[PDB]
Symmetry: C2
Subunit: 228 residues, 2 copies
Amino acid sequence: LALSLTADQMVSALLDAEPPILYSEYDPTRASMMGLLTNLADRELVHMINWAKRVPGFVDLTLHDQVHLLECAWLEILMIGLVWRSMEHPGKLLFAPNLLLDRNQGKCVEGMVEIFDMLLATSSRFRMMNLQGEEFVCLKSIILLNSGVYTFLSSTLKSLEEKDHIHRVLDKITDTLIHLMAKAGLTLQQQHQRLAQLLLILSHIRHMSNKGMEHLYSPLYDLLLEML
Amino acid sequence: LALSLTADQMVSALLDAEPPILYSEYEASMMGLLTNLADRELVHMINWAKRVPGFVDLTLHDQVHLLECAWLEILMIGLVWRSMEHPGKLLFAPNLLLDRNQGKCVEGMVEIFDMLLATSSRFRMMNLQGEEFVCLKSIILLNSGVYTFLSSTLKSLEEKDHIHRVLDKITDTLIHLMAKAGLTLQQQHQRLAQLLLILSHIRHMSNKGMEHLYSMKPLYDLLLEML
Ligand SMILES: C[C@H](CCc1ccc(O)cc1)NC(=O)Cc1c(-c2ccccc2)[nH]c2ccccc12
Ligand SMILES: C[C@H](CCc1ccc(O)cc1)NC(=O)Cc1c(-c2ccccc2)[nH]c2ccccc12
């Protein structure tokens, strides 16, 4: 089980579990921004479930506890995926390697500009700190398990042994980061400061998710069930 | 300045800045009972913000964006912190203790209630000490709307760059607190994480609340006159 894995081990199996590069699908003999979003979000979804299930401990869960998470964390895992490949492309959003975008395109829809700009903003942010792929996967994980921990169902008995399992996985993923930046050669002080700005950027991505939701909402449960 | 303070020094001036406990103002309604009480808590927050080590160095535009972004978040963690010895209940004011059913008559408060109630339990379980709390409340002040000002012009660059160093300062403040406490450094690293990851749930709750607070449709005219 996950709760024996190592820093060394956790990273690797996390890199292992990475989804595949997905290429957009637009008229080459030429368009909508919406459908361009819908299309590939769908497909980015299907491979989430296949990565999620590869996250250590996510399986140890429950099908109900696994469906709540993903139903809460989905837009955030996309965003931090996007923002990661968008780093060497300042001012542009690298959805797919054949679908780099920028501001003016997000303005075509109805509220995408603000989300673009926060998106671009986190990209710059991560750019500044020089985010390693090894921390990125940690943080995609931490976005997964932290999604809807504190809103499962009830304070029952099982609910509690569950919550107790994630909180230990998360704790385990944390030593991974700390240990990653340790290897890197940072003084302990810089480990604690680095880890915090990283864990503070998660508030921003959550905030964009809710932001994003409000127009995506302006079924999914029944879908994750079949896939999970 | 804040970037000269020590842990004990930062704690002190943070403990120092702590606002006063407010009692509610009372067929009674939850809204006006709620509305009434935040306002007056807002007025004390503004005077608490102005006492946060480093917030002053910023700009009236960088000071008015922050507060205007993270207000609901400072209240919520402030409520959720006193609501800790009150399992299932939200201690708004010492005379306005509530629960789900108290929030149920208003049209959406239960969901915010429940998640509100859950963070309290979380804080309880981890045994959140006031000195880590005052720190986290500051961290929500500084993290508020950092990456969302407008432009990275000349001052914005030096400003955001200063914020990130205040926060870097608070960050070590907490560690020494848990360190002093005698945790393995590993235990310091987990706690700081379980702690800072809870700030997304407060943020997530704030965004929810906003959705409803503008479901009932100012601040600027206040922060400007009070700052
Ligand atoms: C810009 C982000 C999209 C993040 C994203 C989308 C697809 C992908 O492959 C990778 C990353 N969108 C939102 O935050 C909200 C959103 C809107 C949206 C925003 C504003 C107004 C209307 C619709 N349409 C969709 C469609 C699919 C996912 C998210 C979203
Ligand atoms: C339950 C939470 C916390 C509100 C709150 C108010 C005062 C205070 O000192 C601490 C916390 N409410 C909100 O986040 C949003 C909100 C609503 C609200 C939300 C949903 C439906 C109706 C009303 N009414 C008010 C009034 C004053 C401040 C915030 C709020």
